[PDB]
Amino acid sequence: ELRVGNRYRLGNKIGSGSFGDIYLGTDIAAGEEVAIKLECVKTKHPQLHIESKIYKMMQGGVGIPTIRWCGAEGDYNVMVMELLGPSLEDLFNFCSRKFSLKTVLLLADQMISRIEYIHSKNFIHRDVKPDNFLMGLGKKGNLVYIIDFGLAKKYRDARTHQHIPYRENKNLTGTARYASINTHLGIEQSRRDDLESLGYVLMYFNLGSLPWQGLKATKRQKYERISEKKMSTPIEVLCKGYPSEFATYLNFCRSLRFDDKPDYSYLRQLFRNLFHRQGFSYDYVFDWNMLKF
Ligand SMILES: O=C(Nc1nc2ccc(C(F)(F)F)cc2[nH]1)c1csc(NC(=O)c2ccccc2OC(F)(F)F)n1
Ligand SMILES: CCCCCCCCO[C@@H]1O[C@H](CO)[C@@H](O)[C@H](O)[C@H]1O
Ligand SMILES: CCCCCCCCO[C@@H]1O[C@H](CO)[C@@H](O)[C@H](O)[C@H]1O
């Protein structure tokens, strides 16, 4: 039996994290399960304390995981969080890697709002991907949460709101599959890039895979092939067979200037108007609704 924080029983691994994997655990006192993130202290660049600080700054926002405890204990840095439900990637697989339009639009609405919230607190996320959105549990089972602040960083000064400077020659940060075109080009990430990535996530959900997925290969040619393919795929080819709003969303995000504040409301309204034009009911009945978590 393994214990951390003189309070939590450590269980088995439930997932990966940017830096440190995630384990199920039990809060022995409260008789409740929790999620426990562990980072090895001999890791080359320890990050967990920084990440926990970001979670603390995000607290109180809708769809932000609650921190219960953080501390170092011997060979591990430990972060204990409220347990959440499955990831959108888990649920996508459950659903045979295709979501209905209704589900994609219900998800888009919340996901835009999560990103907007992180931006409002002065950070960019930098790794918007299905694995980093989790559904809640119980009464919050239809709430989408955003997680993993391991790659996040400030994009503006907290007092003046002066934007970070434009620069280039940046190494890739985040998943190549969902990176913005400017991220592939080595441009410093900013708010538009989180939103562009979300655009690719929504098309991934619509399509089942993206055109730059499953390319094969030095240091390496794989990322270069992804970048080249993504950069040369016409939006209208990517989005063929799906409502025009998906291409409108992507063109909008791509046209944002480096320091522009995105019109989040416009983007949410694009999808909401479509939702209601289609005559969907906003009843939070997702494709996985037969699962009762
Ligand atoms: O990861 C889960 N919880 C979780 N709560 C967290 C709280 C904070 C953090 C943080 F990042 F440290 F902040 C991470 C967390 N991770 C979780 C709960 S259930 C599950 N996975 C399936 O049920 C499933 C797996 C594979 C295929 C299908 C799956 O379920 C379902 F429902 F999709 F079919 N994963
Ligand atoms: C909180 C409910 C328990 C979640 C169980 C889902 C576990 C499946 O998911 C996973 O567990 C694997 C082994 O099972 C690990 O090796 C992987 O890191 C992880 O993807
Ligand atoms: C309580 C009943 C819910 C059963 C949840 C099990 C979901 C298994 O999960 C999955 O679904 C498919 C079938 O294995 C596969 O295509 C996916 O890759 C796999 O991840």
Author numbering: 2 to 218, 220 to 295
Text of the article:
Recently, interest in specifically targeting members of the casein kinase 1 (CK1) family, a highly conserved ubiquitously expressed serine/threonine protein kinase family, has increased enormously. CK1 isoforms phosphorylate many different substrates bearing either a canonical or a non-canonical consensus sequence.
In this study we identified two heterocyclic compounds (5 and 6) as potent and specific inhibitors of CK1δ (IC50 = 0.040 and 0.042 μM, respectively). The sidechain conformation of gatekeeper methionine 82 is more compact to accommodate the trifluoromethyl-group but no deeper/selectivity pocket is opened. CH/π-bonds are formed for all three aromatic regions of compound 5. Hydrophobic interactions exist between the trifluoromethoxy-group and the sidechains of proline 87, leucine 92, phenylalanine 95, leucine 293 and phenylalanine 295. Furthermore, three crystal water molecules are found near compound 5 saturating hydrogen bond functions of the ligand and the protein surface. These water molecules are all solvent exposed and should therefore have no influence on the binding mode. According to our predictions and X-ray models, the tested compounds are not occupying the selectivity pocket.
